[PDB]
Design a protein around this motif. Structure first.
Motif, PDB file in Angstrom:
ATOM      1  N   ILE A   1      46.259 -22.553  69.539  1.00 19.42           N
ATOM      2  CA  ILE A   1      46.965 -21.596  70.121  1.00 19.42           C
ATOM      3  C   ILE A   1      46.530 -20.306  70.153  1.00 19.42           C
ATOM      4  O   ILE A   1      46.406 -19.347  70.999  1.00 19.42           O
ATOM      5  N   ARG A   2      46.143 -19.749  68.789  1.00 21.70           N
ATOM      6  CA  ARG A   2      45.322 -18.745  68.585  1.00 21.70           C
ATOM      7  C   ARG A   2      44.195 -18.722  69.415  1.00 21.70           C
ATOM      8  O   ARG A   2      43.717 -17.647  69.801  1.00 21.70           O
TER       9      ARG A   2
ATOM     10  N   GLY B   1      44.128 -25.688  86.629  1.00 29.14           N
ATOM     11  CA  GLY B   1      45.301 -26.579  86.177  1.00 29.14           C
ATOM     12  C   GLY B   1      44.915 -27.831  85.700  1.00 29.14           C
ATOM     13  O   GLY B   1      43.732 -28.516  86.044  1.00 29.14           O
ATOM     14  N   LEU B   2      45.836 -28.602  85.022  1.00 32.57           N
ATOM     15  CA  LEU B   2      45.358 -29.992  84.363  1.00 32.57           C
ATOM     16  C   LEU B   2      45.284 -30.834  85.611  1.00 32.57           C
ATOM     17  O   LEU B   2      43.938 -31.862  85.583  1.00 32.57           O
ATOM     18  N   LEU B   3      46.449 -30.898  86.647  1.00 30.29           N
ATOM     19  CA  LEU B   3      46.231 -31.801  87.669  1.00 30.29           C
ATOM     20  C   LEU B   3      44.765 -31.621  88.536  1.00 30.29           C
ATOM     21  O   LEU B   3      44.007 -32.247  89.081  1.00 30.29           O
TER      22      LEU B   3
ATOM     23  N   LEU C   1      43.051 -25.411  81.383  1.00 30.69           N
ATOM     24  CA  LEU C   1      44.175 -25.259  80.634  1.00 30.69           C
ATOM     25  C   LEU C   1      43.873 -23.736  79.893  1.00 30.69           C
ATOM     26  O   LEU C   1      44.963 -23.446  79.241  1.00 30.69           O
ATOM     27  N   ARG C   2      42.794 -23.210  80.156  1.00 27.71           N
ATOM     28  CA  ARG C   2      42.364 -21.777  79.452  1.00 27.71           C
ATOM     29  C   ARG C   2      43.547 -20.728  79.729  1.00 27.71           C
ATOM     30  O   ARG C   2      44.052 -20.182  78.924  1.00 27.71           O
ATOM     31  N   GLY C   3      43.666 -20.737  81.123  1.00 27.20           N
ATOM     32  CA  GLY C   3      44.479 -19.647  81.583  1.00 27.20           C
ATOM     33  C   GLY C   3      43.947 -18.374  82.214  1.00 27.20           C
ATOM     34  O   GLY C   3      45.068 -17.604  82.407  1.00 27.20           O
TER      35      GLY C   3
ATOM     36  N   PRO D   1      42.811 -20.188  72.380  1.00 24.61           N
ATOM     37  CA  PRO D   1      43.032 -20.909  73.458  1.00 24.61           C
ATOM     38  C   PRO D   1      41.904 -21.518  74.200  1.00 24.61           C
ATOM     39  O   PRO D   1      42.004 -22.337  75.002  1.00 24.61           O
TER      40      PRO D   1
ATOM     41  N   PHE E   1      41.517 -25.431  74.703  1.00 23.51           N
ATOM     42  CA  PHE E   1      42.256 -26.306  75.556  1.00 23.51           C
ATOM     43  C   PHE E   1      41.371 -26.945  76.885  1.00 23.51           C
ATOM     44  O   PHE E   1      42.051 -27.189  77.766  1.00 23.51           O
TER      45      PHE E   1
ATOM     46  N   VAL F   1      48.685 -26.816  66.069  1.00 26.29           N
ATOM     47  CA  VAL F   1      49.310 -26.288  67.184  1.00 26.29           C
ATOM     48  C   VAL F   1      49.187 -24.639  67.329  1.00 26.29           C
ATOM     49  O   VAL F   1      48.685 -24.017  68.153  1.00 26.29           O
ATOM     50  N   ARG F   2      49.357 -24.270  66.095  1.00 24.37           N
ATOM     51  CA  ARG F   2      49.098 -22.747  65.734  1.00 24.37           C
ATOM     52  C   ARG F   2      47.721 -22.235  66.039  1.00 24.37           C
ATOM     53  O   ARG F   2      47.317 -21.315  66.744  1.00 24.37           O
TER      54      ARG F   2
ATOM     55  N   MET G   1      41.871 -32.841  87.114  1.00 29.38           N
ATOM     56  CA  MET G   1      41.887 -34.276  87.082  1.00 29.38           C
ATOM     57  C   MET G   1      41.160 -34.571  88.436  1.00 29.38           C
ATOM     58  O   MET G   1      40.385 -35.398  88.286  1.00 29.38           O
ATOM     59  N   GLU G   2      41.865 -34.270  89.728  1.00 32.43           N
ATOM     60  CA  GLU G   2      41.102 -34.637  90.643  1.00 32.43           C
ATOM     61  C   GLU G   2      39.518 -34.155  91.022  1.00 32.43           C
ATOM     62  O   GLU G   2      38.696 -34.901  91.653  1.00 32.43           O
TER      63      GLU G   2
END
Lengths: 48, 394, 48
Positions: A10-11, A27-29, A20-22, A13, A16, A6-7, A32-33
Motif C-alpha cells: 500500500i506504500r 476497476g477490477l471488474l 486497481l492502481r487508482g 500502490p 496492484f 499489506v503496508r 476482468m472483462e
C-alpha cells in the motif's frame, strides 16, 4: 508477515496493477472483462 | 544555539508546490465554522496578496510516545522524532484529523483531512517522522528541519495532491515534505505588550474616539472609507483591526518601533491602504499591494532616525506596550502621518498628512479572544449569506 | 484488535464489494459436442 506485506504494497500502490492502481484505473471488474476481450482477440493475446 | 520546536508554540505547516517549474510555498489552512475541509493559501506571494495566517497557525498540544498513546487510548517536554503530535487549530480550537470520508477525486484509498471537535480516537493524532536521513527517531526536532507526517488512524501520509485541477491536501500513501515555521512561543510572550497577529483597537488621545468605518448600510463601497467615531463604537465590532506582519515565520513576535505591518478590518476583511489622492481607503485582499498597505509605528512624531535593524528569528524586545505606549503611525513610502481633518458621533475624517497635527497620538487596546472570534464569524457568515442571497436573486 | 480492524477496513477500501460480486457473476463457456460427435474443448490456458 501479513501486516508488513499489506503496508508495503500500500506504500507502493503500483503493485496492484493498472486497474486497481487508482489514478484513473477502470476497476477490477472492468479489467476482468477487458482481459476476456484480450483473450478472445488473437492479436492482443499472442505475439502475432 | 539552534532552536527546537515545542508544544504551546504556534506554528504553520508549509508545503511546496511546483507550478510552472516554480515553487510556491503553501500553508495548510482550514476555516473553522463552515468548511471543515482543509485547503491551501499562497504564502510566496506576500508582496502582492497578503497571506491569511490566522487559519494557517496551529498549536502543538501534546507529544506522547507510541506506547503511551496506545495505552491511554485503550484506557513542557521536548519533541523527538517518532512521537505523535496533536495539532489544534488556533482560531477554531478544533484538531486536525483524517475525516475518514473521501471525495475520491484521484483514488479510493486517499481520505480527506479536516478538523474535529473531539480528541478521542486515532484520527486526531499524527505521528512525526524524520524526512531527512540526517535525523533519526528520538532526535530533537529542528526549526529548519523538513517533516513527513503519518496519521495514526489511517496510516496515510499528509500529501499535497497535484493530480487534482487545484492543489489539494489529502491523506495518501504517497508522502510529501512538510516544513513547519514558528509563529510565536507562548512562554516568552510578555503580557501587556503588542505582538504580531493581535486584534486591537486604535484609540485616540482622549480614549473617546476610535478609528472605524461607517456603520453598516449593506454597501461595501461606502463602508470602504475610514474615520473616527466615539461612544458605543469603541465596544462594537466595527473598530477591530488585525496587525499582520510582513514576515511569514515568527509573525507572532513582539512588535518593534518602525516595523512594517498591514492593518486588516476584521468585520469587512479589507486592508487599510492609501490612494493617490492621499486619502485612506479600504481595498480588497487581491489587490492589497505592500507599497499601498504597509504602515509603521514610531515613538515620537518628529522625524527621528528610524533606521534599519536586521530582523531576527525570535520573540524580541517588547517595545510597544498596550495603553501605556503612545504610537505614531505613518505609511512606509510616503511618510505622511495619519491625522484628523481638524473639522469635526464626531464623524471626523482621517487623512494622510505630511507634517500632521500635534495631537495625532493613538494608543493600543487589546481585544479579547471571544470578541475577535465573534467578528471573524460575523465576516465569514456575511460572505456566505450574501453569496446565498445573490444566488437566489439570480 | 485495532490493527486487525484497520487492516480489514483497508482491504475493503482496496476491493469494493460490487466488483467482487460482478467478477463472481461472470460465467464460463462450456465445451459442447461438435457435429461429428467430438466435444470441442476450449483451452482453459487461454480462457477464464
Amino acid at each position: 508477515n501479513a501486516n508488513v506485506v499489506v503496508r508495503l504494497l500500500i506504500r507502493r500502490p503500483e503493485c496492484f496493477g493498472p486497474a486497481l492502481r487508482g489514478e484513473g484505473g477502470n476497476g477490477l471488474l472492468a479489467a476482468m472483462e477487458e482481459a476476456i476481450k484480450i483473450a478472445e482477440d488473437p492479436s492482443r493475446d499472442g505475439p502475432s | 544555539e539552534i532552536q527546537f520546536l515545542r508544544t504551546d508554540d504556534e506554528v504553520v505547516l508549509q508545503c511546496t508546490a511546483t507550478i510552472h517549474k516554480e515553487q510556491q510555498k503553501l500553508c495548510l489552512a482550514a476555516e473553522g465554522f463552515g468548511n471543515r475541509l482543509c485547503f491551501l493559501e499562497s504564502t510566496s506571494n506576500s508582496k502582492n496578496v497578503p497571506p491569511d495566517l490566522s487559519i494557517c497557525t496551529f498549536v502543538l498540544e501534546q507529544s506522547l510516545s507510541v506506547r503511551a498513546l496506545q495505552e491511554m487510548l485503550a484506557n513542557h517536554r521536548t519533541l523527538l522524532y517518532g512521537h505523535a503530535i496533536l495539532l489544534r487549530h488556533s482560531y477554531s480550537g478544533m484538531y486536525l484529523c483524517c475525516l475518514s470520508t473521501s471525495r475520491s477525486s484521484t483514488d479510493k484509498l486517499a481520505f480527506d483531512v479536516g478538523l474535529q471537535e473531539d480528541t478521542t480516537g486515532e484520527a486526531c493524532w499524527w505521528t512525526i517522522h524524520p524526512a531527512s536521513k540526517q535525523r533519526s527517531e528520538g532526535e530533537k526536532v529542528r526549526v529548519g528541519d523538513d517533516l513527513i507526517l503519518v496519521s495514526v488512524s489511517s496510516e496515510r501520509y499528509l500529501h499535497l495532491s497535484y493530480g487534482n485541477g487545484s492543489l489539494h491536501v489529502d491523506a495518501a500513501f504517497q508522502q510529501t515534505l512538510w516544513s513547519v515555521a514558528p509563529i510565536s512561543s507562548g512562554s516568552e510572550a510578555a503580557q501587556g505588550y503588542l505582538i504580531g497577529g493581535d486584534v486591537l483597537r486604535l484609540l485616540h488621545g482622549h480614549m473617546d474616539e476610535c478609528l472605524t468605518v461607517p456603520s453598516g448600510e449593506h454597501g461595501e463601497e461606502q463602508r470602504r472609507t475610514v474615520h473616527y467615531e466615539g461612544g458605543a463604537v469603541s465596544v462594537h465590532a466595527r473598530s477591530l483591526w488585525r496587525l499582520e506582519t510582513l514576515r511569514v515565520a515568527w509573525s507572532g513576535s513582539h512588535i518593534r518601533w518602525g516595523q512594517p505591518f498591514r492593518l486588516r478590518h476584521v468585520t469587512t476583511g479589507k486592508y487599510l491602504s492609501l490612494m493617490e489622492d492621499k486619502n485612506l481607503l479600504l481595498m480588497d485582499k487581491e489587490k492589497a499591494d505592500v507599497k499601498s498597505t504597509a504602515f509603521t509605528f514610531r515613538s515620537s512624531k518628529e522625524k527621528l532616525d528610524v533606521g534599519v535593524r536586521k530582523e531576527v528569528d525570535g520573540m524580541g524586545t517588547s517595545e510597544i506596550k498596550y495603553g501605556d505606549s503612545v504610537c505614531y503611525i505613518q505609511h512606509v513610502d510616503t511618510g505622511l502621518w495619519l491625522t484628523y481633518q481638524s473639522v469635526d458621533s464626531i464623524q471626523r475624517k482621517a487623512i494622510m498628512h505630511h507634517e500632521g497635527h500635534m495631537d495625532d497620538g493613538i494608543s493600543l487596546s487589546r481585544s479579547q479572544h471571544e470578541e475577535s472570534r465573534t467578528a471573524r464569524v460575523i465576516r465569514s457568515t456575511v460572505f456566505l449569506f450574501n453569496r446565498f442571497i445573490r444566488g437566489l436573486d439570480a | 484488535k485495532g490493527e486487525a480492524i484497520r487492516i480489514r477496513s483497508i482491504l475493503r477500501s482496496l476491493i469494493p464489494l460490487g466488483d467482487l460480486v460482478g467478477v463472481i457473476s461472470i460465467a464460463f463457456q462450456m465445451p459442447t459436442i461438435a457435429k461429428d460427435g467430438n466435444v470441442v474443448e476450449p483451452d482453459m490456458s487461454a480462457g477464464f
